[PDB]
Amino acid sequence: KQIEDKIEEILSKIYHIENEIARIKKLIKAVGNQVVTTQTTLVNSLGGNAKVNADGTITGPTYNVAQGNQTNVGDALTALDNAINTAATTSKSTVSNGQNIVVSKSKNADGSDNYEVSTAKDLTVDSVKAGDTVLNNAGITIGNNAVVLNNTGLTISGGPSVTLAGIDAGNKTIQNVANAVNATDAVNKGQMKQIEDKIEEILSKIYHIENEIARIKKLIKLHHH
Amino acid sequence: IEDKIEEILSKIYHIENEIARIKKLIKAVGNQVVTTQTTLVNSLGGNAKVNADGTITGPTYNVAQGNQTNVGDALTALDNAINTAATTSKSTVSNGQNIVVSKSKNADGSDNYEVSTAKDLTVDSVKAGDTVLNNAGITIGNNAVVLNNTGLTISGGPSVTLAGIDAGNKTIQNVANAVNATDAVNKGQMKQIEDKIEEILSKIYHI
Amino acid sequence: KQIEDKIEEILSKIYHIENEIARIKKLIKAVGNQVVTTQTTLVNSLGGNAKVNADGTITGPTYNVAQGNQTNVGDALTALDNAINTAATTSKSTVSNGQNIVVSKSKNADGSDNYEVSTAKDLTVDSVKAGDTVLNNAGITIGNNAVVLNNTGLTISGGPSVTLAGIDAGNKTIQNVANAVNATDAVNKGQMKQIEDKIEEILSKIYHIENEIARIKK
C-alpha cells in the first residue's frame, strides 16, 4: 500500500532531520566556544585591565604611559615616542667656558658628547695664594708682611728696604762695596783708612816737630845762661 | 494509524522549535563576533577599522621615524629608540691643562663631574690688577717696580741688579758703622776724622 | 482521505524544514569565515609571534622589550615608559665646582641644561709656573735661581742682595749716592774731597814750617 510506504518515508526523513539538527547544535556550540576563547585571548593579550563582562560586552584596555591615559595601543605608542624625543632633548647636558677657562667639545665613540675643560694660558684674577706667598693687586707678600714687594718697592720687616724714597740699610752694615770711582759713589772703610794713615803721619810729624822745638828752647836757654 | 500521525505531528512541532532556537543561537554568536572584532579594532587603534564587507583593515603605527603594521614591531622600534637616545644623551666631562675632573654617581644614578684646578699651575701669565706674573718675572704697574732675571728696578728710583746697586740720587739711610774694609762708611765715621783734623789745625795754630 | 491529506501536509512541512536546514548550514559557514577574519586579524596585529593554530585555537604574543619579558601589550608599554623615565634620569649629567672653580647652571633654548665653568677670583694653589718664573711657598724664583725672593729677602746669584742680614753690594760699586745728611747716612767719594784737600793744605803748612825750623837751626 502507498500509505504504509509513505509513513515509512516520512519517518526516515524525520530521523535524518533529527540527526542533522544534532550535528548543527554541535557546530554552533563549538563555534560559540571558539569565539569565547578568542575574546579571552584578546583581553589577556591586550592587558590594560581589559575584561569580558557578564552581559557579553567587553571593556577595552586603559593604558597609563607618559603621564596620561590612553584607551588604545596606538595612542600609547605615540605617547611613548613623544616622551622619548623630549627626554632625549632635555637630558643632553652641555658645558661652556667662563673667565680663565677653555672648553673643547668633541664626540665620544658612542656618539655622546665630551667636554674637555682646561684653563686659559693667561689668567686674570684678584689673587693667587701659594702657601705663605700671596700675589695680588698690591704686589707680592711673603709671610705675615715679612717681605713686601709693592708699587713703591721692596721692604723687609726688621731689615733693609729699597723703595722710591731711597735705600734703607736697616741699622746694619752694607758689605762688599767695591772702591768708589765716581764722586757720587759710596766709599768703603779701606778708602777711609787710607786717609787715616796720613793723619797718623801728620801727628807723628807734629810730635817730632814739638820735641825739636823743645830741644831748640832748651838750647836757647843754655845759650843765654 | 492515526496515533502515528499525531506522533509525527508532535515530532515536527518539536523540530520546528529546535530550528527556531538554533536560528536564535546563530544570531547571538554573530553578535559575539561583532563585539570581538570591534573591540579588537578599537583597542588596537592606529586607524584600524572593520569594513562594511566584513574585512578588517589592520593598524598602522608610526613610531621612531618608521611605519609598523603590528604591535610587536612598534614596541621593538621604541625599545631601540630609547636605548640610542639614552646612549647619545649622556654627556661626559674630561680634564685638560691645569684642570682635574672627578667623576661620581649622583643620587638618582646620573653622573656628576667635579671640576677643580690642578694644585700646580703652568701658564703663560697671571694678572692681578696692576701686578703681572710672567716669564720675565714680576711687574707692578706700568713698569713702576720690576723684578726680573737681572734683579730689582724701581722707575725713577733706586735699583739692585746684577750690575750693582744704584741709590737713585738719594741718601742711603740707617747705615751701621763700617767694620770690615769693604763695608760702607757713614757720616759720623767721617765726622770723627773731621774732628781730628780740627785738632791738628788747632795744634798748628798753637805752633 | 483526511489521512492522505494530513500525510501530504506533513511531507510539505518536511520539505520546507529541509530547506531551512540548508540555509542554516550556509549561515553557520558565513559565521565561520568571519571568525577566521577575526582570529587572523588579531594574530597579525599583535605580532610577538602570535599564531592562529590549524586546530582552532590561538597562541598569544610574547614581547621582549626593556630587557624583560612581556605576555601582554600593557606590560610592554609600562616597561617602555619606565625605560624612558630611567634613561631620562640617568643620562642627565651634572657638573659641580671643586677647588678654585665656579660653576653656573642655566637653561639651553631646548630646555636642556648648560654648565658654565669659570675659575674663582682668588686662587689657592701649591705653585704657579710661568715660563722661567715660579711662584710657590718659598716665594718667587726667576731662572735657574738667578734671582730669588723669599722670606729673608732678595738675592741675585753672582750679584748683590737685600736680605734680613743686610745689604750686600756684591763686590760692585754703589752708585748715585746723594750726600749724607744724618750721622747714619752713607757718604760718597765727593764728600771726602774737601777733607783730602785739607790734608794737603796741612801738609804744605807742615813742610814749610819744617824747613823754616831748619833755617832757624842753621
From Swiss-Prot, chain B:
What happens when the protein's gene is inactivated?
Loss of rapid, irreversible adhesion to polyurethane, loss of both an anchor-like appendage and a peritrichate fibril-type appendage on the cell surface. Cells retain type 1 and Fil fimbriae (defined by FimA and FilA protein respectively).
Task: Explain how it is applied in biotechnology.
Answer: Can be used to immobilize bacteria on a solid support; cells can be removed by washing in distilled water, and will reattach as the ionic strength of the medium increases above 10 mM. The attach-detach cycle can be repeated at least 4 times, each time the cells reattach as well as the first time. Expression in the indigo-producing Acinetobacter strain ST-550 leads to cell adherence to a support material and subsequently 5-fold increased levels of indigo production.
* Induction conditions: Part of the ataA-tpgA operon.
Localization of this protein: Cell surface; Cell outer membrane
Q: What is known of its domains?
A: The signal peptide, cleaved at the inner membrane, guides the autotransporter protein to the periplasmic space. Then, trimerization and insertion of the C-terminal translocator domain in the outer membrane forms a hydrophilic pore for the translocation of the passenger domain to the bacterial cell surface. Seems to have 2 tandemly fused passenger domains; a long N-terminal one (residues 59-2904) and a shorter C-terminal one (residues 2905-3561). The C-terminal passenger domain is an entwined, elongated trimer about 450 Angstroms in length that is rigid and yet able to bend somewhat.
Additional notes on this entry: Insertion of a human rhinovirus protease 3C site allows isolation of the intact, folded passenger domain after protease treatment of whole cells. The protease cuts in the tag as indicated GGGLEVLFLQ|GPG.
The family this protein is said to belong to: Belongs to the autotransporter-2 (AT-2) (TC 1.B.40) family.
Q: Oligomeric state and partners?
A: Homotrimer. Interacts with TpgA.
So what does this one do? Answer: Responsible for autoagglutination, and for adhesion to abiotic and biotic surfaces such as polystyrene (PS), type I collagen, polypropylene (PP), polyvinylchloride (PVC), glass and stainless steel (SS). Adhesion is much stronger than that mediated by Yersinia YadA in a comparative assay. Confers autoagglutination and binding to PS, type I collagen, PP, PVC, glass and SS upon expression in Acinetobacter baylyi strain ADP1. Involved in rapid, irreversible adherence to polyurethane. Forms an unusual biofilm. An extended, surface exposed fiber binds to quartz crystals, PS and glass.
What is the designated name of this protein?
Trimeric autotransporter adhesin AtaA
**Portion of the full sequence shown:** 3170 to 3332 of 3630
Swiss-Prot record, chain C:
Query: In practice, how is this protein used?
Result: Can be used to immobilize bacteria on a solid support; cells can be removed by washing in distilled water, and will reattach as the ionic strength of the medium increases above 10 mM. The attach-detach cycle can be repeated at least 4 times, each time the cells reattach as well as the first time. Expression in the indigo-producing Acinetobacter strain ST-550 leads to cell adherence to a support material and subsequently 5-fold increased levels of indigo production.
Disulfide bonds listed in the record = none
Q: What drives induction of this protein's expression? A: Part of the ataA-tpgA operon.
**Entry superkingdom:** Bacteria
Describe the outcome of a gene knockout: Loss of rapid, irreversible adhesion to polyurethane, loss of both an anchor-like appendage and a peritrichate fibril-type appendage on the cell surface. Cells retain type 1 and Fil fimbriae (defined by FimA and FilA protein respectively).
Give its localization: Cell surface; Cell outer membrane
Which function does this protein serve? Responsible for autoagglutination, and for adhesion to abiotic and biotic surfaces such as polystyrene (PS), type I collagen, polypropylene (PP), polyvinylchloride (PVC), glass and stainless steel (SS). Adhesion is much stronger than that mediated by Yersinia YadA in a comparative assay. Confers autoagglutination and binding to PS, type I collagen, PP, PVC, glass and SS upon expression in Acinetobacter baylyi strain ADP1. Involved in rapid, irreversible adherence to polyurethane. Forms an unusual biofilm. An extended, surface exposed fiber binds to quartz crystals, PS and glass.
The misc remark on file is:
Insertion of a human rhinovirus protease 3C site allows isolation of the intact, folded passenger domain after protease treatment of whole cells. The protease cuts in the tag as indicated GGGLEVLFLQ|GPG.
Family (UniProt):
Belongs to the autotransporter-2 (AT-2) (TC 1.B.40) family.
- Subunit note: Homotrimer. Interacts with TpgA.
Domain comment, in the record's words? The signal peptide, cleaved at the inner membrane, guides the autotransporter protein to the periplasmic space. Then, trimerization and insertion of the C-terminal translocator domain in the outer membrane forms a hydrophilic pore for the translocation of the passenger domain to the bacterial cell surface. Seems to have 2 tandemly fused passenger domains; a long N-terminal one (residues 59-2904) and a shorter C-terminal one (residues 2905-3561). The C-terminal passenger domain is an entwined, elongated trimer about 450 Angstroms in length that is rigid and yet able to bend somewhat.
The protein in question is named Trimeric autotransporter adhesin AtaA
Please tell me the species this chain comes from.
Acinetobacter sp. (strain Tol 5)
Gene name, please?
Answer: ataA
Q: Which residues of the full protein are shown?
A: 3170 to 3332 of 3630
